[PDB]
Amino acid sequence: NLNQIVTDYLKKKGFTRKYLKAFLLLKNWI
Amino acid sequence: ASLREFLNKMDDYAPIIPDAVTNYYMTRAGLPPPPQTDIRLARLLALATQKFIADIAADAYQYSRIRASLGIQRPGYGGGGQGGSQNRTVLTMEDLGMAVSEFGVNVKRSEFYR
C-alpha cells in the first residue's frame, strides 16, 4: 500500500504531526 | 588561380543543373534564393555538385570496364532484369556500390526477400 510506504518515509525524516497613464486612458475612453 | 577572377568568369562555367533545383535545395538547406544571394555563389555550388557526381560516374565506369572480358556477382547488390540488350555497357548496382564504397557510402540490399 502506497500510504504505508509514504507514512514510513515521512516518519523516518522526522516530520512532526503615473499621471500620464491616466491621461492616456481618459483620452482613449473619451 | 584567384577567387575574384574565377567568380567574375563564372559566366563561362555555368553547370547543367537548372536554377529551380538549385533554389529548391538551397532553401531546403537554409539559404535564400538567388535574388537575395548572388547568383554566382549558387552557380559555384552547383558546379561543385556536378564535379562530385562526374567523379563518381568516372569511378563507376572504371570499375565496370575491368569486370568485362568464379564469375559470380558479389552478394548484397541485388538488382537488374534480363541482362540488357546487345553488347552495351549497363549501369548496374554492383559497379555503383563498389564505386561509392570509396566515398563512405553503403548500398547493400537483399536479393530474395522470401
Partner: protein, 121 residues
C-alpha cells in the same frame, strides 16, 4: 508481396498508423539484413561460433550507436546519460540568481555583441 512485409504492415497498423508509404517495409527489411550482416561479420572475426561470440559482438557494437529507444527507469535511452550526472549538472546550473531586468528593458534586450548575427551579409 513478400513475407514479413505483410506482417510489418499489420504490426504498424495495430499501433495507430492510419496510412503508409510503399517501400517503407522494404527499407526496414534492408536495414535488418544489413544489421545482421555486420553483426555476423564482427562475430566471425572475433572467433563455428558460439553464443558468447555473438553476445560480445553485440556488446561491442552497442558502444557507439543505438543509444535511444523507449527505455524507462534507468534504461539507457534518450542519449544514454546517467540521471545522477544530469542531476549534478542541474544543481550546478540552478545555483546562480536569475538575471535582473527593469520594465524599460522587458522585451528589447539581447545577448552580448559576440553572440548575435550582426553583419552577416
Amino acid at each position: 508481396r513478400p513475407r514479413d512485409a505483410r506482417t510489418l504492415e499489420l504490426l504498424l497498423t495495430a499501433q495507430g498508423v492510419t496510412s503508409f508509404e510503399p517501400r517503407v517495409s522494404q527499407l526496414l527489411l534492408d536495414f535488418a539484413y544489413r544489421h545482421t550482416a555486420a553483426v555476423l561479420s564482427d562475430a566471425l572475426h572475433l572467433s563455428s561460433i558460439t553464443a558468447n561470440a555473438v553476445a560480445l559482438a553485440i556488446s561491442s557494437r552497442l558502444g557507439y550507436q543505438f543509444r535511444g529507444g523507449g527505455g524507462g527507469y534507468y534504461g539507457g535511452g534518450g542519449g544514454g546519460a546517467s540521471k545522477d550526472w544530469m542531476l549534478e549538472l542541474a544543481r550546478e546550473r540552478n545555483k546562480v540568481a536569475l538575471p535582473r531586468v527593469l520594465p524599460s528593458e522587458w522585451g528589447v534586450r539581447l545577448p552580448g555583441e559576440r553572440f548575435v548575427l550582426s553583419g552577416v551579409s
